[PDB]
Amino acid sequence: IIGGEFTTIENQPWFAAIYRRHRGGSVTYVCGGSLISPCWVISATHCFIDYPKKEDYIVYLGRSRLNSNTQGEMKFEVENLILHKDYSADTLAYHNDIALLKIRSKEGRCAQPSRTIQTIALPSMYNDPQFGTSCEITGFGKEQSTDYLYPEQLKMTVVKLISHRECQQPHYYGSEVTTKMLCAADPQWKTDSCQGDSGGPLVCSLQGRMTLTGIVSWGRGCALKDKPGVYTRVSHFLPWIRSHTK
Amino acid sequence: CPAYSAYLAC
Ligand SMILES: N=C(N)N1CCCCC1
């Protein structure tokens, strides 16, 4: 997250931190995700496609720091890794960038809701806020595009939804943005998602519910004028989600 | 890796 503010997991208690175990036992951060039910985390397929074996991943909930433990946190193995069949990546962007992880503790349990671990609601089908609406993004991604390191402390910021017409201007991304994607950005382009925020939640208030509106997917640079962040449009994937979680 | 990726391994 470029700009924005540091936060803690109580402010985004559905946030899941996803790591990958390596050849030698070392463990590195992969992507964010969101807890949509006690056994299911939703994220992006591009986070997993290069190493698609479920055994190589660990998921934490209730975690506020990247490489240190947070009191109350829970650690999970991945019982099932479900990637979207129609995923693609071009030279620029990702399509159908959505993924589901079924989580299970070494004791065979799912998540236990607490002050630091809660689920987020899915949206009504094809139901999205008006453009101009302010939404939150959360992640352990880079604080600056040129940084080598990731922040140790979770961050969050606010961006506004951009109309599909505006985002599809060649001025922005042209045809690379589809109806199954959502664009959001800061009016001054001063805050944004960045490298390592992928898979994480874009959360808006529709009616009176905090709702998972998007999943961090792609973008040209970070906090770059006329280059918004692009998000998987969750309200367009409800049959796929329900079908695979039933 | 696509050019506009935010995957940390890219
Ligand atoms: N929002 C931006 N700029 N992104 C999304 C996450 C991948 C890096 C580019």
Torsion of CA A181, A227, A19, A112, to 10 degrees: -50
| Statement to judge: residues A52 and A112 lie in one domain | yes
Q: Are residues A74 and A23 in the same domain?
A: yes
Does residue A191 have its Cβ closer than 6 Å to ligand 1?
Answer: no
Catalytic residue among A43, A64, A193, A198: A198
Contact A6, A153 (CB under 8 A): yes
Instruction: Let me know whether A93 and A133 are in one domain.
Output: no
Both A47 and A72 in one domain: the answer is: yes
User: Residues A210, A129: one domain?
Assistant: yes
* CA atoms within a 13 Å half-sphere pointing along the CA-CB vector of A118: 12
Is residue A216 in contact with ligand 1, taking CB distance under 6 Å? Answer: yes
To one decimal, the resolution in angstroms is 1.9
Alpha-carbon distance of A48 to A59, in angstroms, equals: 13
Interface of A with B (CB under 8 A): 29-31, 46-47, 50, 89-94, 141, 150, 176, 193-198, 216-220, 222, 230
Same-domain status, A130 and A231: yes
Q: Give the number of domains in chain A.
A: 2
Dist CA A21 CA A133 (whole Å): 38
Q: Does residue A131 share a domain with residue A70? A: no
A112 and A205, same domain (yes or no): no
Residue A118's region, left for phi above 0, alpha for psi from -120 to 50, else beta, is beta
Determination approach: X-ray
User: Which residues contact residue A111 at a Cβ distance below 8 angstroms, ignoring those fewer than 6 apart?
Assistant: A35, A38, A39, A61, A74, A76, A103, A117, A119
Distance separating alpha carbons of residues A67 and A156, to the nearest angstrom: 18
d(CA A116, CA A53): 28
Same domain, A115 and A171: no
Name which of B6, B8, B9 is nearest A218 (Cβ-Cβ): B6
SS3 readout for chain A: CECCEECCHHHCCCEEEEEEECCCCCEEEEEEEEEEECCEEEECHHHCCCCCCHHHEEEEECCCECCCCCCCCEEEEEEEEEECCCCEECCCCEECCCEEEEEECCCCCCCCCCCCCCCCECCCCCCCCCCCCEEEEEECCCCCCCCCCCCCECEEEEEEEECHHHHCCCCCCHHHCCCCEEEEECCCCCCECCCCCCCCEEEEEECCEEEEEEEEEECCCCCECCECEEEEEHHHCHHHHHHHHC
Structural domain of residue A49, as residue ranges?
13-119+236-246
Q: How many residues does chain A have?
A: 246
Q: Are strands A5-6 and A74-83 parallel, antiparallel or unpaired?
A: unpaired
Nearest to A136 by CA among A202, A195, A186: A202
Measured over all CA atoms, what is the biggest interatomic distance in chain A, rounded to whole angstroms? 52
∠ Cα A157 A136 A242 (to 5°): 145
Question: With 0-12 CB in 10 A as exposed, 13-18 as middle and 19+ as buried, what is A244?
Answer: middle
State residue A15 phi and psi, 5-degree precision: -70, 125
A202 and A155 part of one domain = yes
CATH number of the domain to which A131 belongs: 2.40.10.10
